[PDB]
Amino acid sequence: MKIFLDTANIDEIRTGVNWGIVDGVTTNPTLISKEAVNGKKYGDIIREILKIVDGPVSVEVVSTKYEGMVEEARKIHGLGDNAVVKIPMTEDGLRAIKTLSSEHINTNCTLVFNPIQALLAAKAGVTYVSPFVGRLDDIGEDGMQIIDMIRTIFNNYIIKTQILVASIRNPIHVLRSAVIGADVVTVPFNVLKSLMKHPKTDEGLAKFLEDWKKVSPDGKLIL
Amino acid sequence: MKIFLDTANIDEIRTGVNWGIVDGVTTNPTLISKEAVNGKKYGDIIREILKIVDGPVSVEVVSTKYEGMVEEARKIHGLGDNAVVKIPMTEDGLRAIKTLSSEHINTNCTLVFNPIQALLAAKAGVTYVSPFVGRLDDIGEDGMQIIDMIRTIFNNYIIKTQILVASIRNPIHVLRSAVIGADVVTVPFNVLKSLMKHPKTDEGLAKFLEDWKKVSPDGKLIL
Amino acid sequence: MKIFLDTANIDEIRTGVNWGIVDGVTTNPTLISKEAVNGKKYGDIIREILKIVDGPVSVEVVSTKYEGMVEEARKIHGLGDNAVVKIPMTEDGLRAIKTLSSEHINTNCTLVFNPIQALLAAKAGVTYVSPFVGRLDDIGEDGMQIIDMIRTIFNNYIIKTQILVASIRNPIHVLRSAVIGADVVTVPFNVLKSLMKHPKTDEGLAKFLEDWKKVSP
Amino acid sequence: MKIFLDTANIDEIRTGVNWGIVDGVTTNPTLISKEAVNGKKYGDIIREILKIVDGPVSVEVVSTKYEGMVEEARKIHGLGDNAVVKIPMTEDGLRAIKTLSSEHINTNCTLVFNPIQALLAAKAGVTYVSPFVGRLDDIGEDGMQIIDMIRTIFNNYIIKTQILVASIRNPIHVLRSAVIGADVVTVPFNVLKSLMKHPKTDEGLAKFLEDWKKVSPD
Amino acid sequence: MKIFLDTANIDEIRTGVNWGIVDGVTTNPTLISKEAVNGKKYGDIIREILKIVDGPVSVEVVSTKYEGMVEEARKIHGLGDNAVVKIPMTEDGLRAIKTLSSEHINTNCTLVFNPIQALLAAKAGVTYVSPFVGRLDDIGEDGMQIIDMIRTIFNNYIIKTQILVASIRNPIHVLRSAVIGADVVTVPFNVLKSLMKHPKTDEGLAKFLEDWKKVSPD
Amino acid sequence: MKIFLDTANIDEIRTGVNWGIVDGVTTNPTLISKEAVNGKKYGDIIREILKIVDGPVSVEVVSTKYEGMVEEARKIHGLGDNAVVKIPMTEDGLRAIKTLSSEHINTNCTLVFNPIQALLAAKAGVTYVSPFVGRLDDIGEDGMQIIDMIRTIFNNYIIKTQILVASIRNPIHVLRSAVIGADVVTVPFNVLKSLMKHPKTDEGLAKFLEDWKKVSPDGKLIL
Amino acid sequence: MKIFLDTANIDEIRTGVNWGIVDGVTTNPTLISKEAVNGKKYGDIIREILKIVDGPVSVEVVSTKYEGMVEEARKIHGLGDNAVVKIPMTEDGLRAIKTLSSEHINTNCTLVFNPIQALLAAKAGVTYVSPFVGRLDDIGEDGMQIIDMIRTIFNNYIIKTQILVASIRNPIHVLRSAVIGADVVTVPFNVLKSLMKHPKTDEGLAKFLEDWKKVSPDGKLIL
Amino acid sequence: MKIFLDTANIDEIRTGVNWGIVDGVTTNPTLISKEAVNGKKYGDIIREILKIVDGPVSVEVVSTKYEGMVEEARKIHGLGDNAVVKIPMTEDGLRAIKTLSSEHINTNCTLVFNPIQALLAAKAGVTYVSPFVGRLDDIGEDGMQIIDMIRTIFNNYIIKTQILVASIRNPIHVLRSAVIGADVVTVPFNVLKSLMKHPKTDEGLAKFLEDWKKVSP
Numbered sequence A, B, F, G: 001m002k003i004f005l006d007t008a009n010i011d012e013i014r015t016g017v018n019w020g021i022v023d024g025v026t027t028n029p030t031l032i033s034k035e036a037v038n039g040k041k042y043g044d045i046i047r048e049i050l051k052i053v054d055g056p057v058s059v060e061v062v063s064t065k066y067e068g069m070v071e072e073a074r075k076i077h078g079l080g081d082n083a084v085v086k087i088p089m090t091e092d093g094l095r096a097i098k099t100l101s102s103e104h105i106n107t108n109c110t111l112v113f114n115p116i117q118a119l120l121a122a123k124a125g126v127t128y129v130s131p132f133v134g135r136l137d138d139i140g141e142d143g144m145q146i147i148d149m150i151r152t153i154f155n156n157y158i159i160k161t162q163i164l165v166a167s168i169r170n171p172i173h174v175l176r177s178a179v180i181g182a183d184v185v186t187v188p189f190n191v192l193k194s195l196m197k198h199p200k201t202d203e204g205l206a207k208f209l210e211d212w213k214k215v216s217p218d219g220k221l222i223l
Numbered sequence C, H: 001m002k003i004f005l006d007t008a009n010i011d012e013i014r015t016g017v018n019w020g021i022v023d024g025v026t027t028n029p030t031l032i033s034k035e036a037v038n039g040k041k042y043g044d045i046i047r048e049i050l051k052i053v054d055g056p057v058s059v060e061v062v063s064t065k066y067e068g069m070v071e072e073a074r075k076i077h078g079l080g081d082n083a084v085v086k087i088p089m090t091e092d093g094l095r096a097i098k099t100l101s102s103e104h105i106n107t108n109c110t111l112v113f114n115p116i117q118a119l120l121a122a123k124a125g126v127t128y129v130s131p132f133v134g135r136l137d138d139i140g141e142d143g144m145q146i147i148d149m150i151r152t153i154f155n156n157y158i159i160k161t162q163i164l165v166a167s168i169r170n171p172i173h174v175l176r177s178a179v180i181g182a183d184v185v186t187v188p189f190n191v192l193k194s195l196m197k198h199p200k201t202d203e204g205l206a207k208f209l210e211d212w213k214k215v216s217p
Numbered sequence D, E: 001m002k003i004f005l006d007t008a009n010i011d012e013i014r015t016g017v018n019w020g021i022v023d024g025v026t027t028n029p030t031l032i033s034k035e036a037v038n039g040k041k042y043g044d045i046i047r048e049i050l051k052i053v054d055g056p057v058s059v060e061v062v063s064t065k066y067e068g069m070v071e072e073a074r075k076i077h078g079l080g081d082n083a084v085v086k087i088p089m090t091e092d093g094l095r096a097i098k099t100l101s102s103e104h105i106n107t108n109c110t111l112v113f114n115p116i117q118a119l120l121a122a123k124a125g126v127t128y129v130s131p132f133v134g135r136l137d138d139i140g141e142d143g144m145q146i147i148d149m150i151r152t153i154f155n156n157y158i159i160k161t162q163i164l165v166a167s168i169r170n171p172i173h174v175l176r177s178a179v180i181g182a183d184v185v186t187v188p189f190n191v192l193k194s195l196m197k198h199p200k201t202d203e204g205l206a207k208f209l210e211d212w213k214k215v216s217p218d
Ligand SMILES: O=C[C@H](O)[C@H](O)COP(=O)(O)O
Pocket: A006, A026, A027, A028, A110, A130, A132, A134, A135, A166, A167, A168, A186
């Protein structure tokens, strides 16, 4: 399962990549604008992210109409081969995904809330579908069930579109995504960091290191 | 399923190895502290185990910082081809695993208590991941359920990291691990011994021998 | 299933109670300390909640010793008939619960993280037990499974202790609690606010008023 | 399982009750106005349905404010004891339901789309909750799953609120409602009529008529 | 589980009752007309069956129209209190069932092929519903699944209508009906007879006899 | 679950009753004739069994025709109120069971090999049905599945006829009968005796008694 | 579910009893042998436990013969109303249980390793049956499955004998027992202690106290 | 699924082999001692079976020590290419199996009562492992469940050791073994004899010959 960092913060990105557990990045104008402070320019942020990240970097199109979407998507693509254009599940979005797929521009269909929407995006040629699980949870539907059904559908037809679990709110979204077999999850840095933690890890390490001092007062390992 | 012996006790290790049922050994700083008493030095213990044992021998770094982990890992690796460097599930540990994996040094990520920690370790490139089933049992959670989930997750993504079930307390941990399909179990010597035994084995062998005496008073099979 | 509000924020409590969907309130030392700032005293905050809220209000002791817990519990109890004394799941806590129960003082055992802790609390005679689902989720364990097991265990032994699902983070904790059959959920204000809402209700409402304008301008 | 007819057509209603499979009626302004043709007073329609039906007749309030809802509800109640006041799942709706409940006026909470909304209505004391399964189907979610969850939840808490499956589109919504154990379904007349039919029933009827005219040509 | 004989042959009925495994009888025009020979008239056969059988005897109407159905039904009832009137699942049928049950006349709704039809008949007050499982098998639908669903639905609502599995073709329809918990099966005499048989029973009898001859050659 | 002893041996019966786990007896002419040795008369055997056994005692009718069955059954009944007349699943048997049930003579329908046969016997008023599980096993059908289905059928209709599992061959027939909820099993004395045995019981008792000698050399318990 | 303490250690018993979480005590000859050393007499130990403990206290006979079991059972019973006589699953043990049950002496049948042994003990009239889950685990069989079957069997027949899960080794035996619905578990002191504990309990309480200090430097709650 | 005959009775073996449904034979010290009576020597019985039976024939060592087992195994092996050396599941047995395996001598690990013992035998390189289902049944445990778990474990690790179900008591052990997918069953003669039979086959045969007599006297 790939993990994308949902942020535009370059320090967070570098740190996560160094942990060896970050495979790409998902952005939006809000996340980018957040970093555009103290001299940093909006466009400079996205360009640096595209440069330093080996993997996929998702960038949203703001145009809501077909022509604007494709023209914008082409400009985004021009910024880096690893750019992935984020396009909403709408009639014009599907048309744009079909057109962009033909041009070999990678795409990410967002605002997916049921499995058939996900399937339609895959049929139009989309690279990723991003169902928003936390937003389904918000309205009293278990959002992970939609991920499970999409996984089954995609498996049934050997669909190559990747499931990108989005609107992630907690570590159990991540656990269930992994057990289901979702291709990717995107998570904020704080969620990412929480994924490696457990109180028995902390307690266990403290005990090991206490015991080691019995055999090595300086706490060293000399070999 | 491989069976490793979870101990730093040399006598236990030579004995198990001779039964031909031991495929490797796992140590940790606590186990080594039990052994390095009354003049015995930890460095001598580690070298001796690497010597006696043909299979993988896990030895845990003690530094909690990236650079110290890597440095100690390289020294451990240098002691013999069968050495496997054990690294805790921490931020620095993941960094170390990524680096050491790129250097083709075999690694074992320890103090794992949930399936997502296991997945992160695998993503960082770890050779083995060691979830602690008995310590989960200790806190009122069925530890084997975590092994089942890790197996499912690893299968989903064709992950090559080996699942090494640790903190094993009884033969049912071993049985359930085998039925789940974990790659390795590491067991304490008392548990290892018990695996070979069953009262009906004892009783059946006694009866065979009693019946054989009717036909051969000396108890020999002369062909 | 009762629904309690998990906060010491008086504004939130007034708002939720005015909506008519709050059956009680839970507080803890963190929540209260959060509100007791810039001149506001924890004692006034506690008294205010007890008066505002008709239903059960849980207030947690801070002593870690048996004697201190029972002493504090009696003071909490004396603040009003709706006060429920929250007691942590510790050895001294179980002792305090047993004593408080025999004195007919309502209790709520908190910081419960597995079903056997919950059972121990019930055996001590606790009125409510509050397992923390969100904190289990935080450490990579599906917290709701613990609620499911506690419900089964309590059903097996006809245990009268109410299961009070706490550390709730989202409306699916709530949905799953109701499907399991937990007695009570306690929810943060942001969660409470969402429970009545659905986008199809909104859409349906809009459509209704439009249909009606046809029938009758 | 009770079956309500979701319309204001009096002929449809008589017909269904005569079949002995109609226990009540659910209306709304749209449905009532439909019958308000050729000299028929809108209010007359509602009043006649109320008179003829020996069971619950649901009539919706149009006010969105608590105070308008309860005044409107009391007036609706005054039209017949079998009147049930339909009120939407909103903050003011729940408040109104709680008030009307205490006044012993029967209520029906509508526009419910998940089980927790249904539980909130139950907790307000509502007589019926009406989840809209067809509208859930419309948006790619199997609406009957919500009914199944509400049935379990109501069972858990011995809730006396009746589950009234609404927005029904086909006979399988009905079959699944019955297998789940929902208390009530409300269906359009065309759905109602289709419920009694099966091609093997038609074939069997023709076969029995033919078999019979061997036994007796006359 | 009650067992009714699907016949109008008195000798078959008497023998079945003597085995203690027959609780009633189901007829139709064809079955009665088969026995209506050699002086015996249609009406006498039905009267003789009604008298001898200490249980329900189902007799079918031939009218397809409401009024005719009820007229017939009242005549059939007059023949004896144990008489049960078969009525098809149709609009007029439901109407007749509602009317007859209100008059405390027992009814059996036939030509039921799905669970909702069964529910409708129950709602109209029918005493028995008779889904035809063999005819469902005939068209590539596992008939017993329908009995299963009807059992679940009837259980959900504590429905007192009895499920009477009809169109039985083999002993597995019977086994499955009993495992499901259907109230009644009706079977021809030949199926009834087959129900008692098993080759290990026959083998065991022969062994008992041989074992006994050793113990007591006499 | 009641346990009947399938024997005519009076010593076995007394012994099993003393264990508190025998509730009645099932016989047949073969089992009775076996005991009719060294002066003991066939009829004396059955009469003594009827006298000493509090619970039910099953006795087979040998007549295959209705009139012979009922006349024989009445004579058996005349021997003791606890006599239960064993009658095969045949057309004449069903007629006899119906007649005998009316006379309040208890009956046991044997040679039952499917669930519907069992149901027919119950409808005729039979006290027990005896399906022969071992004989189904003999022909490659799992005989316990028939018991399970009969249990479900009987439960469905609150049938008061007792399921008497017969042709029992091993302790797992007994275990599965108990888990299913069969009313009764009938077993030979040797099977009965085997039911209380387990090697860990033997080993555990030996260990307890060895340890007790540490605190009580004479092995006594003086209180 | 009742919780008994499985020990003859007086200090452990007084401590557990004070936590108010202990509902009774189970002993056996081994446990008593651990305690009756250095001058301490077994008779004094038994009497002291019966004294300290308000709930049932099981004490095991040592004779292997019917008459000795009954005689010892009567002496045990005579020591106090809360005494429960423990009897092994043997031929003589079943005889003893039948007799003692008729005398209204509470009994506990021990060394049970399968569900049919448990059923036989219940049929003989035993008050409690004690299956040994850990010793089954020891021989490679999941001991809890036997508890599940006994629960099902006892439910089927409305058996009033209490299931007392014994040979408990860890908190998951306890958890599974509760979920199954066993009447009683008896646990070693170390296991008992662990049942109350969880790392998130410790961490949560520490944080509450830290946060409270912001509002009350003395850490008191003054109302 | 192969079917072996579990006996040292030469009459039974000849009879079963003549039926063409016996693929091999298993013996053990008890079975052999049963036949080696009244002048008949165990050595002659063993040699006779090896000659009569074309398929695998298992003969069990009697030494309990590693050296004695290997010595006896080599002698057994030298009696014929179809000989399989049966070795008990003990510490010395596992050592012997590992040595015998490296020497390309076929082995059969017996007295196995749980799936982990079976796994250990496989890890030592054993050709066949023989769990005893009937002896488990004897002690109140459904022996077939152990076969099901061993099949799962062996499937998980692509283990080539054949599962040889032993201590078989009835045809349902056999049916269940085949449905699970065990490689081999070994059955006593009384069981073997029953496997081809069914009362409906007999009846069907009788009916066929009667129908045929109509068609053609
Ligand atoms: O692509 C990223 C999405 O915008 C994000 O994951 C959704 O965030 P929210 O649903 O939590 O607002």
